[PDB]
Write a protein that binds this ligand. Structure first.
Ligand SMILES: NCc1ccc(C(F)(F)F)cc1
Ligand SMILES: NCc1ccc(C(F)(F)F)cc1
Length: 330
């Protein structure tokens, strides 16, 4: 079996992407943020503190004939940006783009942090990292992908994110019309629970490619590209007037500047990020300072190939017994 669903940017800056997901019987459709950097499926629900809900669509387990409370199970998650949420756990039927999993753990939020409440377009997250990171206690739960793996035609899903445009998540097959050239596959380490891989280097604009190993994670749930300080400094040095701002929390640049492209290595292949993808617009309404899409990972502890990088490519998440990541130009 296979599934295919359209994913849509939530705003004009591509800050995140939402994908419709059917939960329960009869279906309740929620727009979830597909996150290859986490492993919990959690949703706003009828159990969420009413003051913490502001326009989200909520899951109501009492209206689903297939929902079952997972007795005594709880969950609690904190994300790398300081976001958090927690609650209890149901099992229910979950379908993505025609692909149905029964008995999927659906984590119902009782408390959510402010950053989720203010994001009225995101009804929850669907985690697609490895199940070892799932926070359900005392019995850890599997991700949607792990539960679907057996019935998929191939144990893969692909992310085809659009630049200021809709894109596609596919489960169980590789659309050979969605990319150009060949797919370059590279090894994945699962030791930390992430889709972790090693990039073979980088180039700024039309400069010389610098061969150097950059270990990082493929994370559809993170907007920007976070790379070591040496790399990020070399990129922004090519932008007239760009500087690191402590009050803003990263590199900013004059909105009138033209940004160079950024190339990253996948084995012997090269993925080119157009400079326009790195512009995240004015730091405040009316400002002439703009926020950069490539920032330093020094404060984070891990390098993150977020949406800025992934949307420049067709990306295969191969969940075979030896997992791999594939990248193709598009
Ligand atoms: N998108 C989920 C996520 C968030 C934060 C991190 C960090 F910061 F810990 F690396 C990894 C994955
Ligand atoms: N990386 C996971 C993640 C995704 C989205 C959000 C936001 F933007 F909704 F707060 C926080 C954390």
């Amino acid at each position: 079996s296979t599934g295919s669903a359209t994913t849509t940017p939530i705003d004009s800056l591509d800050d995140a992407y939402i994908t419709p997901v059917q939960i329960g019987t009869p279906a309740q459709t929620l727009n979830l943020d597909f996150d290859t950097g986490s492993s919990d499926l959690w949703v706003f629900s009828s159990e969420t503190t009413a003051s913490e809900v502001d326009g989200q669509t909520i899951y109501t387990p009492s209206k689903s004939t297939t929902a079952k409370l997972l007795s005594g199970a709880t969950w609690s998650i904190s994300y790398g940006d300081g976001s958090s949420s927690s609650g209890d756990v149901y099992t229910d039927t979950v379908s993505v783009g025609g692909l149905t999993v029964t008995g999927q753990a659906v984590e119902s939020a009782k408390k959510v942090s402010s950053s989720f409440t203010e994001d009225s377009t995101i009804d929850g997250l669907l985690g697609l990292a490895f199940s070892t990171l799932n926070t359900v206690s005392p019995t850890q739960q599997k991700t949607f992908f792990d539960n679907a793996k057996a019935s998929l035609d191939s144990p893969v899903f692909t992310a085809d994110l659009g630049y200021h445009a809709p894109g596609t998540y596919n489960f169980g097959f590789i659309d050979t019309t969605a990319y150009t050239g060949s797919i370059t596959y590279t090894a994945v380490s699962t030791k930390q629970g992430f889709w972790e891989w090693t990039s073979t280097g980088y180039a700024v604009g039309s400069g010389t490619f610098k061969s150097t190993s950059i270990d990082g994670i493929a994370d559809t749930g993170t907007t920007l590209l976070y790379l070591p300080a040496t790399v990020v400094s070399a990129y922004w040095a090519q932008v007239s007037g760009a500087k690191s701002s402590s009050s803003v929390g990263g590199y900013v640049f004059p909105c009138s500047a033209t940004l160079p492209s950024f190339t990253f290595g996948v084995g012997s292949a090269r993925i080119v990020i157009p400079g326009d993808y790195i512009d995240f617009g004015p730091i405040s309404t009316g400002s002439s300072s703009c926020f950069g899409g490539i920032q330093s990972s020094a404060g984070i502890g891990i390098n993150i190939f977020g949406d800025v990088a992934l949307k420049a490519a067709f990306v295969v998440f191969n969940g075979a017994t030896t997992p791999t990541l594939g990248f193709a130009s598009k």
